[PDB]
Symmetry: C4
Subunit: 355 residues, 4 copies
């Protein structure tokens, strides 16, 4: 709604660090044939590999570029990524040689978004993941035992043996349920339904676990981000605490590096633009070079049209889309900010014509 | 609770734009017979088609009726809808001719509610859909590999080949789980349970993704709608900012076009009526012609009965059902609005008898 | 947490109105035998039936007992319940006679909690149930078509016919997935995974639909209930609006009819008791007869023990468990309510000894 | 985010009270062999058992150690745990002897986190678990009946009998869906899809049931915990009610017993430390012995680095990580607390050098 996390066109690593798994797995099998992809996909295997050389050395001289110390072991993550597959180059042994090759699949783990999520993975607390856990025990040995008496119900040939109760259990516990045989005695059935609603329910429980994980995460990181953002702009220094709250919790947006049409003029949209730092380019009959501490988008506001203007960043700028409800509420909260509203309209008045 | 999104009786497009898919698919097959629906459903095929002619021309002269520019390409959406199935008329080739015919199924995509939902689909941000994504990778090649060692466990005939590990993987990852064979070695089993709880869990993760999508959507659009609504009524101009908040966030309702009994007199209900614009018809021993800036439903309030009255819109009116808790809280917040409460009761007093 | 919805021991209808379905279905089949339950379960069939006679007449003279008009058609619900199974007595025809018999299963629908839930079922709005709906279309004809090309992939015997694509579609769309055959061509597979994550996702979408349904429901009904409750007690008349808010939103509890030990003295618990109307019985060395407008549970509060006392209702009383955080916050909000806190402690002081 | 529920390294009971189930089930079967684990796992069976002796006597002299009376029957829980498996020692009878042995599996139920969760299990109210329940009835006899007409569709051999409708029903109701046969008549199919989306949906309904359970739980227990915590610290006695609110709802953390590096100096982190009671050890060029009523972590705050310091508890201390947003909001709310902010910075100033 208020966020604009635009990213410059980038081929992500995922293609390069993933591709090895893809071609490997491709030639990874022997569909009764000599080789094609072996030669090919092994070729792209020395290509990818060489990519892992060049990346590594990128760490050699980039071991410190002046780089932050935030995640130290990410490095080790990488180095193992390149290494374990090294000795994965080092086997002359049986075709299981080929098998080990996939170890790279850790590669996407080089870096990713899993960092903060894990941030509340340990910060989750939520022992009810444990209690639910032991409950997984509960159901598991529940149907395990009932399945014991039942599989032992009719002994004569296949039943009456522990394996059946085991497997029927395992799948039944699931939401998946896929298989060759059932109770010929209803009881095994009815209990089966029991384990359905049960094991499924508990599945849900762990769900709500992860759910609260999501929310708590998004909250914490979001509003703290709004810490970094609040102190980050001067006008926020001239505005008192309650307003600090309102914005900290209100401001939701991201930065848009240069190279993209940021908006669409006379096209429907709901959002707001603020110059955190830098300039931003504006098509106007009297073009206007933007700077920090001002705000764009009263174009659409006072003009009456959604995105009555458009802009483009020549320099990377951090954007903040203001919530216009609390804005109107400040306009009407005190006379000073009603003066702000008038003068703002006036700044679009002069901006829309004069220089 | 507070919303009354009543719609006049309308046959939606869905029957006309869907029907082609339905009859097509019907005769779409050849259950060993010459034709019945072919003749028939092809007849309704020229009927539907002609509907697509008449709609198209509706766009010709309706290309601009004075119509908004909001969604430009919706048009193109339609035109392709009618066109690709044109050349879908243009093949003389094999029965796969019949196959292409269904391309219309895009028709429901002409217009729908997907617009805003997509609005936060791009506005979602939520890279954790990406992180979860690569995680889908995680599990997938996890069970893919384990399934590799395991299917290669017993080589002699069917196992030890990549396809099995592949498919067992794919289904197992799911919540579906449907199939002909299992581990004869427990390990494949236990790992199987692992992939169950795992792949399922991640499924949940993407869930909470979409969930936050829902909420954020409903919020944004709702309260902004309450922007359009707040400034839309005069009394809101005589009421200060805090109250503006209370109502903007409180008001939830929709407009009811003419032609429906809006309420039920002396039937249990919780809601409130406000005349945004127009009149509304009221059965009274001294009938009263309603107008904007007044409010209906203190009938039920001060009278003591749920819906102690009923009304009907002769003209389309926008309705707003006030939350009576904060209402009482305004009645008791200041003396002025307690005067409002008394005089309101008095307006039902005069309204319930006099003219 | 704060709610105590204790119900007197009652055999619910569910046993009587359900039992017919249970015995019926029991003898409902013919497991190769003459009859046992037929005679028996038909006996309990005239028993249940007679219960439906006596209930009906209960409506005859109870058509109006002075009873509310809230749900008129509930009656008709019942009468049909007894009637359709009448002509279900009226057939002499084939065994499908027995089949029709189950029509009672509507009986639990006589009355239930579905009323309010349906209250936001129509009050849901949430067209995204529609948009998602057409999306169900999306996926359905998606895999339907892909399955068309694929089942027609290998024509020679079973494939290349519409039925396969149909059914494989239907189950695959699910989370269930249960069946005899798969793609022998990967493509059908990969697309299969697609429909998995897709159809499943949409399932989730409809979920969040129902979820917001839950919440909105519980909220609306809850706090409105707190309307009925707020105006329902005199002290609430001596307390200003902000406090009205705090309690309306804070108070969560239910009424406990006479006949139950309401609390446990010196047993851990978190809750609070308030006499809405009537008395409540209290074991004390100087027993104290309770009355409205007072409050119980500063026993545990000021005493220092959870449930340092226990009580029992001789007369049905409505209970309200106060949130002690905002309570302390009133104690410390103004001096008057700190006097309330002292005098309250003093009322346990005199109550704990004197008469 | 703000919570630090660190636990000293402990082998939980789960290994000892679980292990019996594990080895028992291991030798629990007879994979065609004389015995190995029997001798072994029965040996660890007398080991575990003896553990249950020693625990029991731990209750004998620990029947009261001065121990709380909170959960009385937990004891009985244990004693049965040891007893029923006693007579489970007492059978000389058939191999089902072995079967009974697993009764211990109740052991994890000795104590666990299920206590509060059950706390809102009874405190849930939420009759919609009942309404949904009867709905489970709804669907169940729905597909049960439709399956009746359908299985009786083609009578000649296997169909037309009640069992099929029964089982097809049961699984179909699920999300699992696993089986040998389908409708050869579409109708059974289409209805099948119906039961899919239906039974699944209701599954969701019960979900949202448990969900609200989660939330309500976490809330109640959390903020009440913040009751115990608020009154628990003196500074909270010098701070007025609104601030009491802010902290009660803000403070989220746990206690970290001695023996762990509590923080990481110059490593990225977001949290805060407060000395509830005791001291805490601090590496400083001028080491500082911590005491209650002070706060740690303005190191990171005013210093400019996340965790610009680290600490270790020599004595178990209760930790509270303050939310720095509302903190800044107090710093800027009144001059007194801005003096608090300055002097705090000064306490890191003196602490970072002087003694
Ligand atoms: K399944
Ligand atoms: K299955």
């Amino acid at each position: 709604m208020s966020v604009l996390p635009f990213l410059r066109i980038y081929a992500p690593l995922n293609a390069v660090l993933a591709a090895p798994g893809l071609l490997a797995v491709a030639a990874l099998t022997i569909p009764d044939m000599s080789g094609r992809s072996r030669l090919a996909l092994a070729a792209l295997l020395a290509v990818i590999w060489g990519a892992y050389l060049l990346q590594l050395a990128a760490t050699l001289l980039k071991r410190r570029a002046g780089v932050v110390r935030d995640r130290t072991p990410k490095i080790a993550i990488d180095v193992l990524a390149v290494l374990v597959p090294l000795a994965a180059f080092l086997l002359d042994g049986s075709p299981d040689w080929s098998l080990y090759c996939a170890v790279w699949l850790l590669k996407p783990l080089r870096d990713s978004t899993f960092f903060p999520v894990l941030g509340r993975v340990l910060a989750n607390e939520a022992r009810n993941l444990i209690g639910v856990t032991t409950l997984f025990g509960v159901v598991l040995f529940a149907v395990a035992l009932a399945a014991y008496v039942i599989e032992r119900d009719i002994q004569p040939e296949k039943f009456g043996s522990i394996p059946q109760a085991m497997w029927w259990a395992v799948v039944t516990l699931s939401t998946t349920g896929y298989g060759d045989t059932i109770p010929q005695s209803f009881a095994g059935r009815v209990l089966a339904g029991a384990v359905m609603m049960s094991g499924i329910g508990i599945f849900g429980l762990w769900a709500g676990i992860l759910a609260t994980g999501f929310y708590q995460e998004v909250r914490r990181g979001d509003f703290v981000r709004n810490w970094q953002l609040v102190a980050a702009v001067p006008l926020f220094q001239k505005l008192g605490p309650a307003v600090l709250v309102e914005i900290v919790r209100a401001l939701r947006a991201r930065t848009v590096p240069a190279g993209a049409v940021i908006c669409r003029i006379g096209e429907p949209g709901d959002r707001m633009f603020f110059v955190v730092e830098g300039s931003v380019s504006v098509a106007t009959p009297n073009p206007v070079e933007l700077g920090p501490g001002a705000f764009f988008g009263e174009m659409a506001l006072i003009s009456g049209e959604p995105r009555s203007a458009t802009v483009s960043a020549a320099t990377t700028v951090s954007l903040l889309s203001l919530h216009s409800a609390d804005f109107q509420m400040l306009c009407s909260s005190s006379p000073e900010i009603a003066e702000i509203f008038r003068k703002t309209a006036l700044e679009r008045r002069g901006a829309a014509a004069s220089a």
